[PDB]
């Protein structure tokens, strides 16, 4: 419920799709000029359902729901919020594996130090 920045006009397509008119710069964009200030800038900053700036959900009667990335002028069927999710899941899993490996290497060192200490007692 935040107003449009001055010089901006909301408008519609022949198809009814909303877009925005910048009268100061005399240009048009698919991106609501308020998105700057209200939306997450990255998938990381996303909460809940949110899509980051420049992204949009769309429906196609043949193929179903998909995603539009205005930042790179591309489209995809796979949910970008879910690809990001999994990705961060995969990073954590592999990190705990590296951590377990480092810790286990240190376990070997101490056990070896321990045997060598005992061998010195014998001798």
């Amino acid at each position: 419920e935040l107003p449009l920045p001055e010089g901006w006009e909301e408008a519609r397509d022949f198809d009814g799709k909303v877009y925005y008119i910048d009268h100061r710069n005399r240009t048009t964009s698919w991106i609501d000029p308020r998105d700057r200030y209200t939306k997450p800038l990255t998938f990381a900053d996303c909460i809940s359902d949110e899509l980051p700036l420049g992204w949009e959900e769309a429906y196609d009667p043949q193929v179903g729901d998909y995603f539009i990335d205005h930042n790179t002028k591309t489209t995809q069927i796979e949910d970008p919020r879910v690809q990001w999710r999994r990705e961060q899941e995969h990073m954590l899993k592999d990190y705990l594996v590296v951590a377990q490996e480092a810790l286990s290497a240190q376990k070997e060192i101490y056990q070896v130090k321990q045997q060598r200490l005992e061998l010195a007692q014998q001798e």
């Binding site: 397509d13 799709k17 877009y19 910048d22 240009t27 193929v63 998909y66």
Partner: peptide, 19 residues
């Protein structure tokens, strides 16, 4: 299995508003 191609830019700034 493929998404529709990227539609493109919105309608151009109104030409009757330029000059």
């Amino acid at each position: 299995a493929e998404a529709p191609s990227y539609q493109g830019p919105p309608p151009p700034y109104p030409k009757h508003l330029l000059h």
